[PDB]
């Protein structure tokens, strides 16, 4: 849509990703599809090292290129972390690193597994005729058995899909403001709030499909990166591409465009900077180039917040606040998820840091506080 690559149904997610790569890249696909066994047996690192350097010229279309990022990304996590108990690799082999860095530079992403790879491009629906729902859906790749990566990635994707129904309304909002259509704008804001209220109901599903203790110990360490990590302090070195090591943050739904999309829409100045603003601005370089341009386009438009405040209209303020309260609800709920899935598990292991690399609990509360302080009320 307007070459921002936002689908009506699935939003920022890649609609119907490719499952198979071309025959030339089978050596990659065998390692990626059999990750749980190769890590467990302990021949994952041997297979990656004994591997030819494959050129990325044969990947024709965009879906082929992104599938390769997902394939190469999951292998890079598997190689660096290994069994995930302590033993790590600081150097990444030239035969896998150089094609991955060249592919990453083409798509304007960092050479590391990101939200766009492991959530947005890491899914398939089982029956094409059936609708988008957890029973019908499945991921393409997993790290280990009992990591709960299916339940984890698909619930993130299902909320992304829930937010898509709000994202398609955004043109109506800016069209109504320009054309000076009060009733259209009020209806559009209420529709967005309704869609954001529904995304919170989709969020409830995470308790059914993700074990807290299994998520923290097993899956979290594979999603982690190497930007301010004590295990890789200097960072990872990509052989035959850069001389020194390079630091790149781990995967996180901080790299989701939906969070910033609606804050930017509603004039919630998160990136206006401080400790928390710095992080959210950095995450846009881990987003795809098209979605980075979408968040650009929203900031360029006239402020929806300024428009609503000027009119002296309790109806518009209600509808505006409905959207803002929905965001406060999502962020209030997301903190309860963090309490269950990080804080309580972390205390059982004989300010904690997230995969993105932030003092998470004070970071998230600052972000929620900024959202809550944007409620208009009586003007
Ligand atoms: C077990 C599940 C989850 C955990 C443990 C978790 C944890 C965190 C943590 C620690 C942060 C702070 C940044 C960082 O250090 O990475 C964060 C940020 C964020 N998370 Fe999650 N998260 C989970 C699920 C979700 C889901 C399902 C979504 C959306 C569909 C989401 C959206 C976000 C967003 C947008 C941010 C950026 C800050 C903000 O805008 O509020 N998270 N998450
Ligand atoms: N940031 C989370 C991990 C996480 C949550 N949602 C994600 C989506 C994709 C990749 C990683 C994540 C943590 O520190 O535990
Ligand atoms: O931290 C909560 C995640 C979140 C923030 N804003 C959103 C908008 C839609 C869906 C999820 C979120
Ligand atoms: C959410 N990371």
Numbering used by the authors: 12 to 283, 285 to 362, 375 to 403
What did the authors write?
We next crystallized the F270G-CN-Trp complex in the presence and absence of IDE, and solved their structures at a resolution of 2.69 and 3.03 Å, respectively. In the IDE complex, IDE binds to the Si site in a manner similar to that observed in the wild-type complex. Although both the IDE complex and the two Trp-bound complex of the F270G mutant exhibit impeded enzyme activity, their structures are surprisingly similar to that of the wild-type complex, except that the heme is more planar and that the protein matrix is more flexible, in particular in the regions near the JK-LoopC, the K-Helix and D-Helix, as exemplified by the ability of the R231 sidechain to adopt two conformations in the IDE complex.
